[PDB]
Symmetry: C2
Subunit: 283 residues, 2 copies
């Protein structure tokens, strides 16, 4: 059909190209015009202002830095928001997504919050996924168009903060997982091992994690933090060994001591399951 | 055939039962005799001292607290060590494994270091694995017997510290991965979501991690920490959002700030790839 893309960083440039690849009439906008060059040469239309970019289509795809940058685009484009569906793909907090949705509805438009679980070359893949939250009717109406961004789309609820929350929940896991790999690479280095040497082991470790999360999910939800299969004190001692191995090799112990600190703190409550630390993390 | 198991905590009790299940003539020892009860009732023989436990067989399986506890068992059993293969499965540092091997060889015996990647109910499973390091001839001779402990056995090298290193490399990843899950559970709680609600998402996230580790392994080993697919500054900002989301919900920010701290530190070098922090972690 036809669509608008505002924000042409690597994410938005990949979204526009996926829309052009699918035969969509594409209208664009970016603060730096020289980022739309390749897209314009392919047949995308560059708007001179955000107003013209907005009023060109009912579906408007936003891929800006954050929600704070979004208020700048809309700063004078007020009337073009009415009767339009604004899909905000800028990864920020659930609170900032709720404040963005509230302002858009006030302007007579609808806000869909998106959490894209894809790097830019994954944009348009049938295997990638995006979390969506906000008004169900707008999600349903434009679902086929959001499938252009990622083949899979996952509607979480009416709450604007929901897709943002899911996005953060993902990053809570990803960043430390990758950082634990940077820690593994650094230790294995002081021992003549390369990153590709430990890659199969680390991949296999992450691949088998789901068995543990399912086993633990059932016990947490029931309120069971036993000693049946594991004890926190042994976790503390295992982390002391990880800290010692890294310290012995001259490798930095900042990330492993941070993990040890959470286990040591907790034993001060308790030497039940290593899951018991959750009760110290919750509000 | 016939075998000895010293140390009857849940790990050693599961090892002895796997040996009895396979028709092995089993000789035992533990500091607390009441932990061998069930095993003796099944046909295992309880020794009165470590000396008698050692001299009963050429293959001796050790499952003690650590290497420091091992010197106590051997404290007066000196002569029973000669001509015996001692498999030390006590998870401790590579340095303590090298000091344990050195003492055993001095006593005329051979030390095999083991790193069991299994909880006690996984003991004897064809799907589980154990890392082994030390003299190749002893590993080769007794491989069928070590397959009773875990179906898969992975000989890493002649170095006593090697299997211990591999064991730590595993724990470097496991403990933070599980802790990131405890962090995810805590955040999702302040938002009406259960652990089983987020379990599929977290499992899927870990399952897809191997793609990232393989992509990054090749670039690290070559010395490439570009900006091609990612920038450290965006990682810092993404972690700031994870920290803010948790702080907004009243959830503890200790584990996410520790991750943010490693990214923020690093940008002080550099805003190339988020992999660039490795050069600050190495010796």
């Amino acid at each position: 059909q036809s669509v608008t893309v505002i924000g042409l960083g690597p994410m938005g440039q990949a979204m526009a190209a996926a829309y052009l690849d699918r035969g969509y009439e594409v209208t664009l906008w970016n603060r730096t015009a020289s980022r739309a060059d390749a897209l314009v040469a392919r047949g995308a239309k560059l708007a001179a202002t955000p107003e013209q970019a907005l009023s060109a289509n009912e579906l408007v795809i936003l891929s800006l830095i954050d929600y704070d940058a979004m208020y700048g685009v809309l700063e004078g484009a007020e009337e073009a928001v009415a009767g339009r569906v604004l899909v905000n793909l800028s990864s920020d907090t659930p609170e900032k997504a709720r404040a963005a949705a509230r302002r858009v509805a006030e302007l007579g438009g609808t806000h869909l919050t998106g959490g894209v679980l894809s790097p830019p070359p994954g944009i348009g893949s049938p295997d990638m996924s995006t979390f969506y939250s906000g008004p169900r009717a707008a999600y349903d109406q434009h679902r086929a168009a959001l499938e252009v961004i990622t083949g899979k789309t996952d509607y979480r609820g009416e709450d604007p903060g929901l897709a943002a929350l899911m996005y953060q929940l993902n990053m809570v896991v990803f960043w430390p997982a990758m950082l634990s790999y940077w820690q593994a690479v650094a230790l294995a280095d002081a021992h003549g091992l390369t990153a590709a040497d430990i890659a199969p082991y680390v991949s296999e470790n992450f691949a088998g994690m789901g068995q543990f999360i399912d086993f633990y999910a059932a016990r947490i939800d029931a309120g069971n933090h036993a000693g049946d299969v594991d004890r926190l004190s042994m976790g503390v001692a295992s982390m002391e060994h990880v800290v010692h191995t890294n310290a012995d090799s001259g490798v930095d112990t900042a990330f492993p001591r941070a993990v040890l600190d959470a286990f040591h703190r907790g034993a001060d409550a308790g030497a039940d399951s290593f899951s018991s630390v959750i009760k110290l993390m919750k509000k």
